[PDB]
Design a protein around this ligand. Structure first.
Ligand SMILES: *c1ccc2c(c1)OCCOCCOCCOCCOCCO2
Ligand SMILES: [Fe+3]
Ligand code: NA
Ligand code: NA
Ligand code: NA
Ligand code: NA
Ligand code: NA
Length: 45
């Protein structure tokens, strides 16, 4: 399962912690729960 990390605050998106929803399937209006940036500010781990 592909993890992503927020460029700005280091928050880690692990799909297993979000009912197995892959990062790429998140809505375009999702944002980092810590700092509020869009999905554009994430990088794959
Ligand atoms: C995460 C951080 C800040 C947000 C978020 C999410 O908004 C999610 C819902 O967005 C709906 C589309 O945008 C509505 C208005 O956007 C401009 C102001 O948004 C406030 C911050 O929203
Ligand atoms: Fe963040
Ligand atoms: Na991968
Ligand atoms: Na974790
Ligand atoms: Na938060
Ligand atoms: Na926005
Ligand atoms: Na990477």
């Amino acid at each position: 399962m592909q993890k992503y990390v927020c460029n700005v605050c280091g928050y880690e998106y692990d799909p297993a912690e979000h009912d197995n929803v892959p990062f790429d399937q998140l809505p375009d209006d999702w944002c980092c729960p810590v700092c509020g940036v869009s999905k554009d500010q994430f990088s794959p781990a």
